[PDB]
Symmetry: C2
Subunit: 133 residues, 2 copies
Amino acid sequence: KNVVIYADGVYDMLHLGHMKQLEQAKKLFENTTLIVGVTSDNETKLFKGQVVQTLEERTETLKHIRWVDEIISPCPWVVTPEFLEKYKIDYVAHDDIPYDIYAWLKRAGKFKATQRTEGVSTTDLIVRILKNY
Amino acid sequence: KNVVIYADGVYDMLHLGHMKQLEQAKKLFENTTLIVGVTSDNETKLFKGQVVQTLEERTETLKHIRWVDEIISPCPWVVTPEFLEKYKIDYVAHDDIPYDIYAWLKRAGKFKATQRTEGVSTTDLIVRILKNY
Ligand SMILES: NCc1ccnc(N)c1
Ligand SMILES: NCc1ccnc(N)c1
Ligand SMILES: NCc1ccnc(N)c1
Ligand SMILES: NCc1ccnc(N)c1
């Protein structure tokens, strides 16, 4: 009955959007283990761009989040069939918002969609602070 | 054996410092319920000063934190003996960093000290972003 869910990401400056996404992945089935992968500094810079917090800082914040059961830090940038078998992962939870490399997961019945929440990012709150001066 | 711990605070723009403090309060005894109080917007402004996030925003983030068992939102600004009895609270966890109104708790054996962690605040990270331009 226990289902292993994997979600990966940068988790830079963790905000309520990340946390709601993690909650959604945790709650995809009644009984889950949610494994979170945290991307390396070098690979995040190479493929996505700047990152504000180091791998160690992004990983430490994640350990305080209720929905996170296990952490792979750092995690590989691209998910592979071999990775799923190594960690006995039953489903990969993704927002399907580009960053379709995941078609093979959908084909296999192993893709579970999650959503984002806008207007909650750390960035947006400095904007809220500054719109008082 | 279960001990009810109460920690209150603003919890504005929650960062790793808050989370480590909550972890410390949760882990003060083997078996605890950690109740977190979140201060009202009006009282935080009157007594401490500006607050960036609303009560609802600060409370929602807290529900995602692993160590938080129950939330009183909003909570009273000053802890009273009557409040401890109403909620069956065994100890109040505070950093003892001023903001001694807590002498009566120390007298009663109900004060448990927790510590802060500097350099982790949301504020500090924009400073880290800006020191690249
Ligand atoms: N490692 C995959 C990945 C990378 C960046 N952002 C994501 N959401 C997922
Ligand atoms: N940066 C990833 C992410 C996750 C959830 N919500 C967002 N708005 C963004
Ligand atoms: N409600 C008490 C209080 C108010 C502000 N900051 C704290 N840490 C505690
Ligand atoms: N603002 C309260 C607080 C809690 C923990 N650590 C800090 N540095 C500050």
